[PDB]
Design a protein around this motif. Structure first.
Motif, PDB file in Angstrom:
ATOM      1  N   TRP A 173       7.647  46.305  33.456  1.00 56.96           N
ATOM      2  CA  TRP A 173       7.935  47.164  34.607  1.00 56.96           C
ATOM      3  C   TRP A 173       7.178  48.494  34.485  1.00 56.96           C
ATOM      4  O   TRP A 173       6.701  49.032  35.476  1.00 56.96           O
ATOM      5  CB  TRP A 173       9.437  47.409  34.746  1.00 56.96           C
ATOM      6  CG  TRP A 173      10.256  46.156  34.631  1.00 56.96           C
ATOM      7  CD1 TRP A 173      10.767  45.604  33.479  1.00 56.96           C
ATOM      8  CD2 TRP A 173      10.627  45.274  35.693  1.00 56.96           C
ATOM      9  NE1 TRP A 173      11.432  44.431  33.768  1.00 56.96           N
ATOM     10  CE2 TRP A 173      11.359  44.205  35.118  1.00 56.96           C
ATOM     11  CE3 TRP A 173      10.413  45.279  37.079  1.00 56.96           C
ATOM     12  CZ2 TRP A 173      11.872  43.154  35.883  1.00 56.96           C
ATOM     13  CZ3 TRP A 173      10.926  44.226  37.844  1.00 56.96           C
ATOM     14  CH2 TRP A 173      11.645  43.180  37.242  1.00 56.96           C
TER      15      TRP A 173
ATOM     16  N   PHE B 253      20.741  45.264  42.624  1.00 59.41           N
ATOM     17  CA  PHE B 253      21.680  44.537  41.769  1.00 59.41           C
ATOM     18  C   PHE B 253      22.641  45.587  41.198  1.00 59.41           C
ATOM     19  O   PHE B 253      22.285  46.357  40.294  1.00 59.41           O
ATOM     20  CB  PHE B 253      20.941  43.811  40.648  1.00 59.41           C
ATOM     21  CG  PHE B 253      20.294  42.541  41.095  1.00 59.41           C
ATOM     22  CD1 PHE B 253      18.913  42.450  41.214  1.00 59.41           C
ATOM     23  CD2 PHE B 253      21.077  41.443  41.457  1.00 59.41           C
ATOM     24  CE1 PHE B 253      18.322  41.288  41.693  1.00 59.41           C
ATOM     25  CE2 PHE B 253      20.496  40.276  41.937  1.00 59.41           C
ATOM     26  CZ  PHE B 253      19.117  40.197  42.056  1.00 59.41           C
TER      27      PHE B 253
ATOM     28  N   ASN C  59      15.733  46.430  38.962  1.00 61.43           N
ATOM     29  CA  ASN C  59      15.392  45.781  37.701  1.00 61.43           C
ATOM     30  C   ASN C  59      14.415  46.588  36.839  1.00 61.43           C
ATOM     31  O   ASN C  59      14.410  46.454  35.614  1.00 61.43           O
ATOM     32  CB  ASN C  59      14.817  44.383  37.941  1.00 61.43           C
ATOM     33  CG  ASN C  59      15.835  43.419  38.521  1.00 61.43           C
ATOM     34  OD1 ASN C  59      16.231  43.555  39.675  1.00 61.43           O
ATOM     35  ND2 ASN C  59      16.264  42.446  37.721  1.00 61.43           N
TER      36      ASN C  59
ATOM     37  N   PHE D  59      18.618  48.217  33.609  1.00 61.08           N
ATOM     38  CA  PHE D  59      19.989  48.694  33.589  1.00 61.08           C
ATOM     39  C   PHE D  59      20.515  49.220  32.269  1.00 61.08           C
ATOM     40  O   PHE D  59      21.336  48.588  31.609  1.00 61.08           O
ATOM     41  CB  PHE D  59      20.891  47.589  34.112  1.00 61.08           C
ATOM     42  CG  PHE D  59      20.432  47.016  35.413  1.00 61.08           C
ATOM     43  CD1 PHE D  59      19.448  46.043  35.443  1.00 61.08           C
ATOM     44  CD2 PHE D  59      20.974  47.461  36.615  1.00 61.08           C
ATOM     45  CE1 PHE D  59      19.011  45.514  36.652  1.00 61.08           C
ATOM     46  CE2 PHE D  59      20.548  46.944  37.832  1.00 61.08           C
ATOM     47  CZ  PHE D  59      19.563  45.967  37.852  1.00 61.08           C
TER      48      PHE D  59
ATOM     49  N   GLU E 148      28.472  41.597  38.651  1.00 57.16           N
ATOM     50  CA  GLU E 148      27.159  42.044  39.098  1.00 57.16           C
ATOM     51  C   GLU E 148      26.831  41.264  40.356  1.00 57.16           C
ATOM     52  O   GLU E 148      27.020  40.055  40.395  1.00 57.16           O
ATOM     53  CB  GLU E 148      26.100  41.792  38.016  1.00 57.16           C
ATOM     54  CG  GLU E 148      24.739  42.391  38.341  1.00 57.16           C
ATOM     55  CD  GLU E 148      23.863  42.580  37.107  1.00 57.16           C
ATOM     56  OE1 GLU E 148      23.657  41.589  36.374  1.00 57.16           O
ATOM     57  OE2 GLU E 148      23.378  43.717  36.871  1.00 57.16           O
TER      58      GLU E 148
ATOM     59  N   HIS F  42       8.548  39.125  35.088  1.00 58.10           N
ATOM     60  CA  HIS F  42       8.210  40.229  35.979  1.00 58.10           C
ATOM     61  C   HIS F  42       8.287  39.858  37.458  1.00 58.10           C
ATOM     62  O   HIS F  42       8.844  40.602  38.255  1.00 58.10           O
ATOM     63  CB  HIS F  42       6.805  40.713  35.635  1.00 58.10           C
ATOM     64  CG  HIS F  42       6.434  42.011  36.275  1.00 58.10           C
ATOM     65  ND1 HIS F  42       7.027  43.206  35.929  1.00 58.10           N
ATOM     66  CD2 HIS F  42       5.510  42.306  37.217  1.00 58.10           C
ATOM     67  CE1 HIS F  42       6.481  44.182  36.630  1.00 58.10           C
ATOM     68  NE2 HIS F  42       5.558  43.663  37.419  1.00 58.10           N
ATOM     69  N   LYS F  43       7.710  38.716  37.817  1.00 58.09           N
ATOM     70  CA  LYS F  43       7.713  38.233  39.202  1.00 58.09           C
ATOM     71  C   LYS F  43       6.752  38.972  40.142  1.00 58.09           C
ATOM     72  O   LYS F  43       6.129  38.359  41.009  1.00 58.09           O
ATOM     73  CB  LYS F  43       9.133  38.294  39.778  1.00 58.09           C
ATOM     74  CG  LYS F  43      10.159  37.485  39.004  1.00 58.09           C
ATOM     75  CD  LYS F  43       9.847  36.001  39.061  1.00 58.09           C
ATOM     76  CE  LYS F  43      10.837  35.189  38.246  1.00 58.09           C
ATOM     77  NZ  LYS F  43      10.549  33.729  38.316  1.00 58.09           N
TER      78      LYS F  43
HETATM   79  C1  LIG Z   1      17.242  41.485  38.203  1.00 61.37           C
HETATM   80  O1  LIG Z   1      18.433  41.502  37.400  1.00 61.37           O
HETATM   81  C2  LIG Z   1      19.474  40.633  37.919  1.00 61.37           C
HETATM   82  C3  LIG Z   1      20.681  40.804  37.013  1.00 61.37           C
HETATM   83  O2  LIG Z   1      20.534  41.936  36.163  1.00 61.37           O
HETATM   84  C4  LIG Z   1      18.979  39.174  37.978  1.00 61.37           C
HETATM   85  O3  LIG Z   1      19.969  38.334  38.564  1.00 61.37           O
HETATM   86  C5  LIG Z   1      17.682  39.099  38.793  1.00 61.37           C
HETATM   87  O4  LIG Z   1      17.178  37.773  38.760  1.00 61.37           O
HETATM   88  C6  LIG Z   1      16.647  40.077  38.210  1.00 61.37           C
HETATM   89  N1  LIG Z   1      15.414  40.068  38.974  1.00 61.37           N
HETATM   90  C7  LIG Z   1      14.255  40.204  38.336  1.00 61.37           C
HETATM   91  C8  LIG Z   1      12.991  40.202  39.180  1.00 61.37           C
HETATM   92  O5  LIG Z   1      14.179  40.316  37.107  1.00 61.37           O
END
Ligand SMILES: *[C@@H]1O[C@H](CO)[C@@H](O)[C@H](O)[C@H]1NC(C)=O
Ligand SMILES: *[C@@H]1O[C@H](CO)[C@@H](O)[C@H](O)[C@H]1NC(C)=O
Ligand SMILES: [Ca+2]
Ligand SMILES: [Ca+2]
Lengths: 635, 99, 272, 635, 272, 99
Positions: A520, D66, D196, D200, D262, E147-148
């Motif tokens: 990130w 989230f 994200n 967190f 969550e 990361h996506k």
């Molecule tokens: C972001 O975090 C949530 C839970 O903390 C998770 O369900 C979700 O898939 C995450 N998204 C990414 C892009 O990491």
């Protein structure tokens, strides 16, 4: 008129300017020793305030502050050797100088020798410092830093001196002055202005040391060395006289009685209103106060300020120069105590400067030598500094200043003792400082020998070098107010971000262990880069003639430096919020400093502190990017 | 320190039956600005009355002017009653034809 | 020939319902030109030459200065009451401030506070301080002099701004402000066996300054013989004044009335 | 087109709009219970996101967060009357409702009755609360406030219920929902965004209660009252059934097992780009989530949002309306847990909104009755609100809304449960909230009975009243984006300042005792007044046609609200920095609250805290003034 | 007739002095048009039709994209080295990315990473993921897929931007980019007692695609008889290729050389 | 995996003594891009030499082209020595007049 014409007008103006006369005029008994708050200080302030009026500037005004500094008491401070066996007393010296903001106290114990007092020097020391007095060399870092490092290791008292190697002075009896406040501004109005409206509430800067600190002549240092053992490490490359630790039988007793003193400070200002957007402006300043004669520490700077204010007044009134933005000339006081005048201004007029003052140029200690030309400033001013070095010529070499194409990657950041530091770290105003200096520190700084006689005797081509300095400052000013575009290169932050990422791969293992990712943060510097590109593009497709659309784009630019100030910490408790150049856990270096502790698997490392440090630095960066890219919906 | 008003009834122009003139009542020198004034005709309060803006003199004493347009006759009687805190009963002052 | 601009403020404590307690009056050469009221805190004009000749710009400046002074004096009023331990009481604060410009253009400024109808504090520009008119005023005197700012500001207004605004008002007035109308003098007289009283009225004139004295056998009597001229106001910017004289039943015709006024070339002498 | 034309276009547009259909459409089993993060929530989000596309708005996008909310565990929560040994005895109720963010725990002790839980109610209580469970009535204040007040008095657990007097509902078995977080936004990402990128970190809002809090039916309350003594004060004007304190022999045991969960929240946005300065904009929003049917708490608002976004799209695309500035339509979620969606947005895009988003209009709970029309907002929107009330007509009375000329001095400030609160107190964005309400709280809020059936049955002329609401919101929007001037009346702050000075003379004695003066604060509100006057003058002398000079002046205006955010506290630890409407020691009321303690000469009063409070409030005000007046050199 | 745009990046670890480790090459239809160098990180043009026809605008976009990719890949390089526990070692990272546009305008995109000269990761747009070419690549594979964002961005570039910039480059090229010059074929031959070797060189031509085959008795021999054409480059955008054939001392004249090339109407047959 | 270069010396146009031509040396297929190349004349390194931009092929193997303008004679000998890490001594390849 256009750059080339302005460049020339300025140039000729300079050629007929006598800096030497001004510097020398600033060393007459009329303003000889000008300690902040003294009559001579006030006299020089009135002189400058009048010169501003003579130059006929759009407006000339002054700010008045009541701050608390520290001076030496009627009782002499002293360093005495106390002979354990039969309590026999030696008495090394009753120092002429002193360290402002030292704790008033008298202590005694073993005298251990740290080196420069660097955090590292203490680290690699053999003898524990815990519970004893430390002696260190002036240099590499601030007194406040030295004292702060010693105090964190439970040392008691600190003695500072100038070794003959780093400071090749003839007179070894020479004493000096300095301050140990780990911060800036009036240490008793931390994070707020020293104004009567304040009714000066009881507030104490957390940067104030809690142990005594004293200055001693080289002679004294050697006398103390005559009661110490252990050859000083050759690695230190210092006098063949020093040694660490006193003989078990002997120990020293430091005694300082410095007292606080409330004084009246005067900041003299002058402005040259802009022709298009006067509400935006550049600030150029210099320290006026000095402990001794302060020729180099104060004179040269103030001389430069006076001249610059003059030349630009003419150019505007005669040569028809028409800056789109304003130019402020400021002469501050109480700089010797930590850029106090300047800090009080920034804390006082915070709301008025926000996104209005867009660059600060410091003129202090601009001339200390000839060999080199150093520079410290926000990356946003690198390109401007570069172009300037490419067209300005060295006062002696005759060659162009731009001689190293990698100069930018060797730029040392702004430090606490620099008046530019507060502007960038606290205010969010890109700032810059520069000098024609040597690889050696100007020996006489903070001493009684910092006089004109010495200054010109050391650098005879003073007037020419002073001119070169005036020329670079002059050009910065032109470039910054001259036309539609602000010469602030926000792209330079991509290299700083990438460098932070590099400083971070050595801890990728640790990050992985804590089940965290660096992806990130990686995509954040990515998005910042994209943003810079989008903005440069927007400029490209814009008609530099539409003063409205150009205002909008320049606004995005002025916000860049500001968005790097941490929006998660208290400005009062942590004034230096800039995550790149500030101080505090919100800082990017601080994030690394913590991570480094995770090596030696012992307490030190604070993981929850770190997990937070990361979350915030990451978002402070994505945020800076999302703003730079423009309009929320277009992210 | 409180101060009682000074009532002065008079006409804009010399009284001359049949000719529409103006009846003035000018209170002055009173302090607590809070004061009420009425212009009477045969003992009755007249409506459609006008007054200037309350103001005061060097000694901080207030003064106000009331005035109505009227047509004088030898049958009708005119006077204004001024009620202030410094007065027990609303002091009345009749209009002396001569002034 | 010196001109003057001055504002009058008057407020009462107990009475009201929403902070800001003052009403104000603006006078240029003793000519009411503006009024800041209580109900519907707005600035209405007085006299036609201002409700037309005054630019939309100047009026804004005027409105603000008045609303500002309201607020500033409201604070002062609260301050002063409190330094008297006053509260559940009904008091009054009045302020008069202005400047007076002499022929040579030099100016004199003033600022006075009147607590409950009596001198309290008088601003002294040349020394940036105030003079307490009575002991109970000293607290406030000191409280204001520590500040230092207040005095400098008040002086700035009297020295710079006030004079400036007086100028604007004068140029804007040349015509209806210096338009002086002469008096219509009329000697009347009430008779009785007791004695005969003579009344000399100077009608519908402007400005207010005027001279009225009796003449016995066409000669000047002493000021001691009659009371001073009694200037009264008409609800229309015109004034009238009269002087009375009691004389032996029968000697009526022996007395004349002399009326001097700038609105007349030579002194007018009336006889009934 | 000009105000009058826009006014009319809007008006007619409204007359042909069916709000009733939309509100009712929002209550179909398709979105019946829409708890934040639920499918039905997501469904309604997609519906709205699509309506925005249909309306063809400049752009329509969505943000995804989230966050951590709290739901009830598989184990029932319960209120039981127990015997001195912990023995089972009565079992009052296994509540259907619950309070989000209550501490998961089970406690037992004496049940004392506070009233509404007001800080004052506890003050005037006879029975000490220390160590026992408190029972209070819903109303007057927030659950979080009630719980926070009880906890500061060492109470343990809090039971909340609706008495028949304040809440005349038929069914006494009716349960309800609420949250006890003394703040806004995701309580686990305090002062920063739930994204994200954040990974967190472990961060816990200091506004989270440390005692259990439960909701109980009226019936249950009466059952507990059957085991208590002491007639409930007539002063309270409440049910003839309540009593304070349980019989010494009996005590209650509250047990709540709520668990964190969550979830994924969706904020749907829509913007109508401006024609001159699109970079500046207004934000109009409404809560979409709801515990039950949420007709009044969520439906009406969202219905209004949909319509408004439609009407303005037409006006722009058909009637040729051309707003100089942009308009953002936002549908937030997790509002029931404390304006979470909205807060996360503000914390997420802070840097993008700074001095760009200049006003926020909330549409939540806009229609709850007919009798009155209340309003809560920044003083900067008073004039706009006034003018609007003078030309908008009451949906039933037919008369103009402006009926009381002193309405402004009776305006109640924004509270934590209002989505507008974060915008003003944290962001520095002037905000506003309004309703056609009654003197009685809409009984069904937070219950299962907040359905369409009930809403229209209670207020049959719904469609007409909804129209009136839509009309006032509509006019605010026009007025704020319509022409060169922003209808933000910064002069209104002079009355607020003067009022603070009034609230302060009762403490002039104390100030005098501490050797302090109120003269500098006095001269500060003075200088602010001067500044407002100078700015109104500058507008006056300006050619409303020079879009450049007008930009400059409006910039000064947009900075007014912002300069009242304290620059001396940490936004993370004290998000609500606004010295007039925030929370915390930096607040103006807080300064008074401290000063009030100096009465009863016992500890409580913190003098150094006060001396600092004064110094900063004073300077925050002088600063706001010095900025408002323009250009540092012109002060 | 499909066109293509693709960039090439190459970096080395140990060598350098200031972060940012890549040099890049830009190719439009296999025609080098731009070069991002190491020393003095600047974007210089290659080929006259770009160093003139390319607008000041497009060049900016190009410069930024290259500097950006430099930074982005520098990070990736660091990431990949670290996931190999590499550091005090000298390695290399290479990336190739671009798009290929078909006659019907449809596009195909690609993005590949080469660690130390071997396939490491290949971006798969249709599934927003990467395929590890070897076990040691899996760490990075996963790290990027969590990361996506990365994948979605890379796809956006290949799908939207790349194609778009290829278009701009083509229109901007019509003239010197499709300007094809025919080859100057010359059959030579070295003789010895051992055998006689025939060399058929196709000189100074463009583009690079060309066909060279030997003809025995004016007939087509098999590809097995000779090695494939050996295309070489001249430092001026022109190429030359040759094919060799060993034949029985004396039968020289029995063999001819056939050269097909788009820059020629009918296939040219040369004889020495 | 490291790879050794493939040196190929040749001329732009068919060698013809007296006519100024061009001498090329084209290394390819080598890996560690780090490589040095010199064009020799009678065993001496020629200055005023030119080269193209380093680049690489699908298999990530690098390739670079060097070339100098020269006038051929039957007396002079031409060849380029290529030094790479995969080579012990700088491999030399002379120019075969025929190619
Ligand atoms: C972001 O975090 C949530 C839970 O903390 C998770 O369900 C979700 O898939 C995450 N998204 C990414 C892009 O990491
Ligand atoms: C301001 O405060 C200082 C120190 O408290 C005092 O010495 C000085 O006289 C004060 N100045 C004014 C103008 O009140
Ligand atoms: Ca300070
Ligand atoms: Ca949050």
């Amino acid at each position: 008129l256009y750059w080339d014409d302005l460049k020339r007008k300025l140039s000729e103006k300079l050629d007929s300017t006598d800096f030497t006369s001004t510097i020398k005029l600033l060393n007459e008994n009329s303003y000889v020793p000008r300690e902040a708050g003294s009559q001579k200080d006030e006299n020089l302030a009135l002189y400058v305030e009048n010169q501003f009026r003579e130059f006929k500037l759009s407006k000339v005004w002054r700010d008045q502050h009541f701050v608390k500094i520290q001076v030496k008491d009627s009782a002499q401070n002293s360093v005495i050797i106390v002979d354990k066996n039969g309590r026999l007393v030696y008495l090394v010296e009753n120092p002429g100088g002193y360290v402002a903001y030292s704790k008033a106290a008298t202590v005694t114990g073993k005298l251990v020798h740290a080196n420069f007092g660097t955090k590292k020097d203490f680290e690699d020391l053999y003898t524990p410092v815990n519970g004893s007095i430390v002696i260190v060399r002036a240099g590499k870092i601030t007194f406040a830093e030295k004292v702060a490092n010693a105090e964190s290791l439970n040392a008691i008292g600190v003695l500072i001196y100038m070794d003959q190697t780093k400071f090749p002075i003839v007179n070894a009896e020479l004493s000096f002055f300095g301050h140990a406040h780990l911060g800036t501004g009036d240490p008793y109005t931390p994070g707020f202005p020293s104004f009567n409206h304040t009714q000066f509430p009881p507030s104490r800067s957390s940067g104030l040391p809690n142990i005594p600190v004293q200055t001693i002549s080289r002679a004294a240092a050697e006398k103390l060395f005559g009661n110490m053992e252990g050859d000083c490490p050759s690695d230190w490359k210092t006098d063949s006289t020093c040694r660490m630790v006193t003989s078990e039988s002997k120990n020293v007793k430091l005694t300082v009685s410095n007292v606080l003193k409330e004084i009246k400070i005067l900041n003299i200002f002058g402005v040259i209103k802009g022709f298009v957007e006067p509400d935006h402006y550049v600030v150029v300043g210099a320290q006026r106060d000095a402990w001794g004669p302060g020729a180099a520490k104060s004179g040269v700077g103030t001389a430069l300020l006076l001249k610059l204010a003059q030349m630009f007044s003419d150019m505007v009134l005669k040569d028809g120069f028409q800056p789109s933005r304003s130019i402020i000339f400021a002469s501050w006081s109480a700089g010797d105590f930590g850029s106090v005048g300047a800090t009080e201004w920034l804390e006082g007029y915070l709301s008025s400067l926000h996104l209005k003052a867009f660059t600060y140029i410091n003129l202090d200690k601009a001339v200390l030598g000839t060999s080199n030309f150093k520079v410290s400033a926000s990356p946003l001013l690198y390109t401007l500094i570069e172009k300037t070095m490419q067209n300005v010529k060295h006062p002696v070499t005759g060659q162009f200043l731009y001689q190293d194409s990698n100069w930018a990657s060797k730029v040392e950041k702004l430090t606490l003792d620099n008046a530019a530091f507060p502007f960038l770290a606290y205010s969010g105003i890109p700032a810059v400082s520069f000098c024609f200096c040597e690889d050696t520190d100007y020996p006489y700084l903070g001493t009684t020998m910092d006089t004109y006689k010495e200054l010109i005797e050391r650098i005879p081509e003073l007037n020419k070098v002073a001119r070169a300095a005036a020329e670079v400052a002059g050009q910065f000013v032109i470039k910054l107010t001259h036309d539609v575009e602000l010469n602030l290169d926000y792209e330079r932050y991509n290299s700083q971000l990438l460098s932070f990422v590099r400083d971070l791969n050595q801890y990728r293992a640790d990050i992985k262990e804590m089940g965290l990712s660096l992806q990130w943060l990686y995509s954040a510097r990515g998005d910042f880069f994209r943003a810079t590109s989008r903005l440069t593009t927007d400029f490209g497709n814009a008609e530099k003639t539409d003063r409205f659309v150009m205002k909008k784009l320049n606004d995005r630019v002025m916000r860049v430096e500001y968005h790097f100030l941490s929006p998660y910490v208290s400005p009062k408790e942590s004034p230096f919020r800039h995550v790149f150049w500030g101080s505090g856990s919100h800082t990017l270096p601080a994030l690394l400093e913590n991570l480094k502790l995770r090596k030696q698997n012992n307490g030190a490392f604070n993981e929850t502190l770190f997990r937070n440090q990361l979350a915030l630095a990451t978002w402070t960066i994505q945020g800076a990017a999302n703003a730079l890219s423009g309009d929320v919906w277009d992210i | 320190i409180q101060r009682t008003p000074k009532i002065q009834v008079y006409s804009r122009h010399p009284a001359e039956n049949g000719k529409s003139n103006f009846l003035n009542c000018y209170v002055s020198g009173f302090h607590p600005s809070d004061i009420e004034v009425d212009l009477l005709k045969n003992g009755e309060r007249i409506e459609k009355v006008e007054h200037s803006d309350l103001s005061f003199s060097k000694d901080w004493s207030f003064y106000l002017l009331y005035y109505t347009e009227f047509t004088p006759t030898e049958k009708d009687e005119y006077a204004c009653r001024v009620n202030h805190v410094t007065l027990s009963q609303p002091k009345i002052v009749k209009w002396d034809r001569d002034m | 020939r010196s001109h003057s601009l001055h504002y009058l403020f008057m407020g009462a404590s107990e009475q009201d319902l929403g902070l800001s307690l003052f009403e104000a009056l603006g006078y240029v050469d003793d000519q009411l030109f503006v009024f800041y009221d209580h109900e519907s805190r707005r600035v209405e004009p007085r006299t036609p030459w201002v409700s037309s000749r005054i630019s939309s710009q100047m009026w804004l400046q005027l409105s603000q200065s008045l609303k500002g002074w309201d607020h500033m004096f409201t604070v002062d009023f609260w301050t002063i009451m409190e330094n008297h331990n006053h509260s559940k009481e009904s008091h009054t604060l009045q302020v008069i401030l202005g400047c007076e410009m002499q022929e040579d253009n030099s100016t004199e400024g003033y600022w006075k506070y009147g607590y409950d109808g009596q001198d309290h504090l008088e601003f002294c520009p040349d020394t940036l301080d105030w003079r307490a008119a009575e002991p109970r005023a000293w607290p406030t005197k000191l409280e204001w002099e520590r500040h230092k700012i207040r005095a400098r500001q008040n002086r700035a207004y009297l020295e710079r701004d006030c004079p400036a605004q007086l100028q604007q008002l004068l140029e804007l007035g040349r015509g209806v402000l210096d338009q002086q109308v002469p008096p219509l003098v009329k000697v009347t007289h009430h008779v009785t066996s007791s004695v005969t009283t003579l009344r000399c009225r100077a009608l519908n004139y402007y400005p207010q300054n005027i001279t009225m004295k009796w003449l016995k056998d066409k000669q000047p009597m002493d000021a001691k013989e009659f009371e001073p001229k009694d200037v009264l106001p008409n609800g229309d910017g015109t004034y009238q004044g009269w002087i009375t004289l009691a004389v032996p039943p029968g000697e009526e015709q022996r007395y004349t009335c002399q009326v001097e006024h700038p609105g007349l070339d030579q002194p007018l002498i009336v006889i009934w």
